[PDB]
């Protein structure tokens, strides 16, 4: 049992209560009780965590990300439109990674993520097809203690239209191999079903498995319908990348949202990612079927895609979470940095300093994010009965001083290093910035290994790591 | 206790589950819907009279969310082809001023006749000529006798908008023989007059008549006047209403939108109903949404006067209470809800290039249950539900234009002309039956129309207004 005491609790509960000098009691992975110190004595606990002078929040929820690609950041990944990045960087880089590289990628990602207060990660696994990768990744997620949705991507249909464009893009890095990860529909089903049977609900309920048809052009109608029915039969969600680029825009003369509507493929268990190339009608169609959304505001900028209509969706009460997207289209895994970006980009583009409140941005990173993953009954707020995914932030630093309104301070001032202590499913995963799965005496050597492995991955893939200085 | 039973109709309830009940009945006791049922499962209670609706469709009465009644005598030639301010200064103000109380009584009856014939049972009358002696009394006597449910929103203007004067003179030169009028009043005088009007008429005619304060616009009324209206609505559990952003010259009250200006002073609240909202951006919609402001949309008039097209689909998708108003009797120029529904459906589809932008069901909701919500009256009217007032209309779809008919909302919105309403009940009283009006019987109808025609001709002569401009193709 664990008692967190004397903090300010930012509950994100139904009344958005903010409780000064208050406590939380945790038992068997759950929040069992809460109270105010002046009115009540906290129950006895095996241990007390002192949060005096600190702010307690629900853990941040990364609503859509791609983990293993983190080893491709730091030089190779920037300055390219989506498809250029995909074909010259992501596909070949992923392919050159071995299972032992994956294990290091995952631990590096989880170290950055937990340090920034992320406790749930929706991993869209585009490299699950390669032998050994699932097993390597899953062993590290389990050990680390993070809550993970492992959304297994598949592609079962050739999009032949885009080929002369692809060859031109490939000529930018001709020594880098063009890859294919297409699989037959029935093979994808069997592989995802077996993955779910083996890993879903493992690591004490912390790991889930979803089917992830990649896009409306890369997956057949049958494949998407299978994913849809699978989500329904197993009480999970299914997810798809929607309208991330201007070449996706026209699946057969209508938008991807329209196309899915025609086939009855929009439902309340679908979470779509991106939605940059969206019009009013598309928003209406998602709204009507209660589709969940993950917005990758930073990555949409990094890749030169654009700006999604998040304010419109939010004003319709839609469940919109925030994803950091790829470890190499951001290039950080920092929810607080992404929140600030979500606040500012929309203000700038609408010329409206009040287009999204910092409270609302904080909601997107917590309780609404949970809702976007279909997990809001279990996580995303500090409420009795929910899982004990909790973070303690210290605002006593120069950047976060002064602080009066907590959501404003967090969104507009915090850098992302203010998170001290992190609980996931009631287990202490970080304490005073010390990571339980990467102790301080191993941290530097681990980073050097990740650095070396990245350098080697890029050599095997024939990718340029450090292009010559260019001002224009 | 007086009772009425409507039997064997198809009931388009607009209730919480949007039930459509075939061969079903409604029981009315003292103006109120007491019970409903399906004939195959239940026997209707005994009643003082049975109305047979066999082969007919029963709806809640239509709600005209925002209109100006007396101006109806200015249609038929004098009113069209002019932008808002041109129309306002060369037609509406001088036409209204030339009307006597006896003209007002005729205008009101004519309006109510057209309205009831088209299935309208509640009318939100924005009274811009309430300042002239005798007009209130003449109008109220007719509204009371007619039996319609009426919100009498008493407009006032207490502040000069000096900025628009050289524009006005130019506009006035289009009809120089028509005189420029002023209806300004001192703040304290407007307050006393509206208070006395409310004390005298609010809740009269069996609860059918209500009184609201109506500051005209954010440029024609002081902050103090708007705040008084706001507090008055709160203290008396009514609404207040204002015209917002109807034109491109209203747009800038002091370097921000009217919605912004009102937000600055705390003048947006849940008892405010705003009319028009054409010159509105995403921020304005957000502000209204945030404070649960009600909206009346005058889609036909916004076209007629060359204002434009309001963002109704954006407001509706946010769950806002948007009703449909027909607006002025002379900026439409009909008082026909079914016609205006069809226009609401189509203008938005055309401008968005989206054939499914608003369903016909949603349009019908705007004319009924959402309209009631826009007036703050949805607890009392707008659907066929137990406890609500018996404002009910019977439509006959056995006409060429409404054949075939399967989906009723689509049939009503896209096919009906507006003459298919047969019978109208308001507060449980039969105001029209088989198209015969209780306050304008068939043997008087033609002579009454001739008197309205003469009076209109004479009003236009007294005002020096051109009734019938020479044929012009271009
Ligand atoms: Fe992505
Ligand atoms: Fe009006």
Curated annotation (Swiss-Prot), chain B:
GO biological process, one term: atrazine catabolic process
Compartments where found: Cytoplasm
One annotated Gene Ontology cellular component of this protein: cytoplasm
Residues under site feature: Major determinant of atrazine specificity: 84, 328, 331
Regulation (activators, inhibitors): Atrazine dechlorination rates are reduced by aminoatrazine but dechlorination is not inhibited by either melanine or CAAT (2-chloro-4,6-diamino-s-triazine).
Reaction catalysed by this enzyme: atrazine + H2O = hydroxyatrazine + chloride + H(+)
Keyword NAD tagged: no
Binding residues annotated for Fe cation, in chain numbering: 66, 68, 276, 327
Origin: domain of life: Bacteria
Primary localization: cytoplasm
EC number: 3.8.1.8
Cofactor (UniProt): Fe(2+)
Quaternary structure, from the entry: Homohexamer; trimer of dimers.
Function text: Hydrolytically dechlorinates atrazine to hydroxyatrazine. Also dechlorinates simazine and desethylatrazine, but is not active with terbutylazine or desethyldesisopropylatrazine. Has no deaminase activity with melamine.
Family of the protein in this entry: Belongs to the metallo-dependent hydrolases superfamily. ATZ/TRZ family.
Protein name, UniProt field: Atrazine chlorohydrolase
């Amino acid at each position: 049992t664990l008692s967190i005491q004397h903090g300010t609790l930012v509950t994100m509960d139904q009344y958005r209560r903010v409780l000064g000098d208050s406590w939380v009691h945790v038992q068997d992975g759950r929040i069992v009780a809460l109270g105010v110190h002046a009115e009540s004595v906290p129950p006895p606990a095996d241990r007390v965590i002192d949060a005096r002078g600190k702010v307690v929040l629900p853990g941040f929820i990364n609503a859509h990300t791609h983990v293993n690609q983190i080893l491709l950041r730091g030089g190779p990944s920037h300055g390219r439109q989506f498809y250029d990045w995909l074909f010259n960087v992501v596909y070949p880089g992923q392919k050159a990674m071995r299972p032992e590289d994956v294990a290091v990628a995952v631990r590096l990602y989880c170290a950055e993520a937990v340090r920034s207060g992320i406790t749930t990660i929706n991993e869209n696994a585009d490299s699950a097809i390669y032998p050994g990768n699932i097993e390597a990744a899953m062993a590290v997620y389990g050990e680390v203690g993070v809550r993970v949705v492992y959304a297994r991507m598949f592609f079962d249909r050739m999009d032949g239209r885009i080929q002369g464009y692809v060859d031109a893009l490939k000529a930018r890095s001709p020594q880098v191999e063009l890859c294919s990860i297409m699989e037959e529909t029935a093979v994808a089903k069997d592989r995802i079903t077996a993955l779910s049977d083996q890993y879903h609900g493992t690591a004490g309920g912390r790991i889930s498995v979803w089917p992830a048809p990649a896009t409306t052009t890369a997956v057949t109608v049958e494949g998407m319908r299978w994913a849809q029915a699978f989500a329904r039969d197993r009480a999970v969600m299914w997810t798809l990348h929607m309208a991330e680029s201007d070449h996706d825009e026209r699946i057969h003369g209508m938008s991807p949202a329209e196309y899915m509507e025609c086939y009855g493929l929009l439902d309340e268990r679908l979470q779509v990612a991106h939605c940059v190339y969206f019009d009013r009608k598309d928003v209406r169609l998602l709204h009507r079927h209660n589709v969940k959304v993950a917005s990758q505001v930073v990555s949409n900028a990094y890749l030169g895609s654009g700006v999604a209509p998040v304010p419109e969706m939010v004003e319709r009460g839609m469940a919109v979470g925030i994803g950091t997207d790829n470890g190499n289209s951001n290039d950080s895994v920092n929810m607080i940095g992404d929140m600030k970006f979500m606040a500012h980009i929309h203000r700038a583009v609408h010329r409206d300093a009040d287009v999204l409140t910092p409270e609302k941005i904080l909601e997107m990173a917590t309780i609404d994010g949970a809702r976007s993953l279909g997990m809001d009954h279990e996580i995303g707020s500090i409420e009795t009965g929910k899982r004990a995914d909790l973070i303690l932030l210290d605002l006593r630093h120069p950047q976060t001083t002064p602080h009066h309104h907590l959501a404003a301070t967090i969104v507009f001032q915090a850098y992302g290093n203010e998170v001290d202590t992190v609980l996931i499913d009631g287990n202490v995963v970080m304490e005073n910035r010390r990571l339980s799965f990467l102790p301080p005496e191993r941290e530097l050597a681990f980073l050097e290994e990740a650095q070396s492995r990245a350098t080697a991955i890029l050599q095997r893939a024939n990718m340029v790591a450090n292009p010559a200085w260019r001002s224009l």
